[PDB]
Amino acid sequence: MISKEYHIDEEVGFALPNPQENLPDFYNDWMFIAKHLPDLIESGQLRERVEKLNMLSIDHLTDHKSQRLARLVLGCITMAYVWGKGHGDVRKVLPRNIAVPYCQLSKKLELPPILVYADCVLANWKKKDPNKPLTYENMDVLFSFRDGDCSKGFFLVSLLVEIAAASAIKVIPTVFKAMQMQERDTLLKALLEIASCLEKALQVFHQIHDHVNPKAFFSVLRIYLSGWKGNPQLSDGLVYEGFWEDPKEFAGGSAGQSSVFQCFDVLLGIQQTAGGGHAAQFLQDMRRYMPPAHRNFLCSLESNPSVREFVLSKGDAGLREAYDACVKALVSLRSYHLQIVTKYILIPASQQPGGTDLMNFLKTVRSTTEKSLLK
C-alpha cells in the first residue's frame, strides 16, 4: 500500500473519500449562501449577503474533512462574489469578513485562496445511496453555481476519471518494489495493469458528452472556474481585504491541478516539467494548487529511480511493450481531452458574437508523451 501520509485512497485515489456535506452549526451563514448560489446569483443579492456576514473564526473546523468542506464552501462563494452573474461586472475586492477566514484556512491547508480542482471535484461529491456503487446515476455534487451550468456532469465525470485512475495508482508501489528487487515478471505485470486501468479511465471519460452541453459549459461554468492570473478583467489580481494590502493573482480551476494529470507522467519518466517551456512551467506551478499530501506524493515519485531508464537498460522487448502500452494509453487520454476542448470551448468561442492557449498547452503535453514511446 501507499503510505497514509499521502492521502491516497484504495477505492477513490486522490479524491476525498466520503466527503463531509454539513459543517458545524456555527458556519450556517456560510452554508446557506453556498447551498443557494443559483437563486442568490440570479436575483443579484449574493454580493450583499456576503457583505452582511460577520467574520467567523476558522477554529471550529476541527477535522480535515470539515476543513475541506469549508474550503469548498468559501471557494464557491468567492467565485460567485468575484464574477457575479458571469456577464463581465466584476468585484476587485473580496470583503474582510469572508477573505480573512478563507485565507487563514487556505494557509492552514497549504492551498491558495481560490477554488481549485481539489475543492470542486475531489471534495464536491456524495453517493445518493451509500450501499450502491460509484456510478454517475448513484452520485451528485454538493455545490453548483447556476441552474443549467452542467456542474454535476463536469465535476462528476472528472471525479469518475479520477476514481478509474485509482486502480492504476495503487499499483505504483509494486512498480518500484519490482525494480529495486529486480522482479522483471512482476514489473511487466504491474505495467500492463496500469495500461489496462488507464484504458478504462478513457472509456469513463466518454461520459462527459452525456452530461455536459457546450453552450452551458462555455458561457456559464467556465466563467465561474476562471481565476485572476493574467486575466484582463482583474489585471492586478484580487484584493483579499484584511489579509494582504496588495492584490494577489491566482490561476483558476484546471485539469492541470489534478494529481492524475501529472503522476503517471512522473512515474514513467515523461519529463513534462523539463525543457523550460510554458507547459512545464504551468504543471510545476499547478503543484502548489494541489493538497500538500498529493504534491508530496509527486515529489516522492520524482525521487524514486526512473522506470523509463530501467526498462530502457534491460534489452527486453516484453518490458518495452508493457511500458509503451502505458504511454499509448496516456496519449489517448490527452488526445481525448483535446477533443473535449474543441467541442466545449473552441467551437462555442467561434459562435459567440483565448481557448487556443489551453489547446497549445495540451498539444505540448501530448507531443511530449508521444516522444516517450520506446518503439
Ligand X SMILES: O=C(Nc1ccc(F)cc1)C1(c2ccc(-c3cnc(C(F)(F)F)cc3CO)cc2)COC1
Annotated binding-site residues for heme b read: 337
Q: How many helices (H) and strands (E) does the chain have?
A: 19, 4
Under a CB-based contact definition with an 8 Å cutoff, are residues 302 and 172 in contact?
Answer: no
CA geometry: angle at 322 spanning 178 and 320, to 5°?
A: 90
Q: Which stretch binds ligand X (CB under 6 A): 114-122, 187-195, 288-296, 305-313?
A: 114-122
Nearest to 306 by CA among 126, 145, 175, 142: 175
Query: Which residue's CB is nearer to ligand X, number 97 or number 124?
Result: 124
Q: Which of 340, 346, 361, 366 binds ligand X (CB under 6 A)?
A: 340
* Nearest distance in Å: CB 168, ligand X: 8
Is 154 a binding residue for ligand X by CB under 6 A? The answer is yes
Residue 117 touching ligand X (CB under 6 A): yes
Q: Minimal distance in Å, beta carbon 340 to ligand X?
A: 5
Binding residues: 337
**Identified binder of ligand X from the candidate list 67, 167, 254, 368, rule CB under 6 A:** 254
Q: How many other CB atoms are found less than 10 A from the CB of residue 212?
A: 22
Residues 6+ apart with CB under 8 A from 268: 307, 308, 323, 326, 327, 330, 372
Q: Which is nearer to ligand X, 31 or 157 (CB)?
A: 157
Q: Which is nearer to ligand X, 208 or 301 (CB)?
A: 208
| Residue nearest ligand X, CB atom distance | 253
| Given 109, 255, 307, 319, the residue binding ligand X (CB under 6 A) | 255
Q: Which stretch binds ligand X (CB under 6 A): 28-36, 101-109, 137-145, 158-166?
A: 158-166
Q: How many CB atoms lie within 10 A of CB 147?
A: 13
Contact status: 8 vs ligand X (CB under 6 A): no
Stated as kind and residue range, the H or E segment containing 51 is helix 46-51
Q: Which of 70, 121, 163, 188 is in the footprint of ligand X by CB under 6 A?
A: 121
Measured N-to-C along each axis, helices 96-109 and 64-83 cross at an angle, to the nearest 10 degrees, of 140
| CB 6, min distance to ligand X, A | 17
Report which secondary-structure segment, H or E, holds 28: helix 28-35
Q: Of the ranges 32-40, 105-113, 153-161, 239-247, which one interacts with ligand X (CB under 6 A)?
A: 153-161
User: Coil, strand or helix: which one is 192?
Assistant: helix
Binding of ligand X by 327 (CB under 6 A): no
Contact assessment for residue 301 and residue 2, using Cβ atoms and an 8 Å cutoff? no
Judged by CB under 6 A, the residue of 261, 282, 323, 361 near ligand X is 261
Q: How far is the CB of 195 from ligand X (least distance, A)?
A: 12
Residue 102 CA to residue 58 CA, distance in Å, equals 8
- Give the Cα-Cα-Cα angle 135, 138, 141 (nearest 5 degrees): 95
Minimum CB–partner distance for residue 175 and ligand X (Å) = 16
Q: Does residue 70 contact residue 108 with C-beta atoms inside 8 Å?
A: no
Cell numbers given for 87: 456577464
Q: Which is nearer to ligand X, 38 or 214 (CB)?
A: 214
188 or 225: whose CB is closer to ligand X? 225
Contact call for residue 224 and ligand X (CB under 6 A): no
The binding site for ligand X (CB under 6 A) comprises: 117, 120-121, 154, 157-158, 161-162, 165, 208, 225, 253-255, 258, 260-261, 264, 330, 333-334, 337, 340
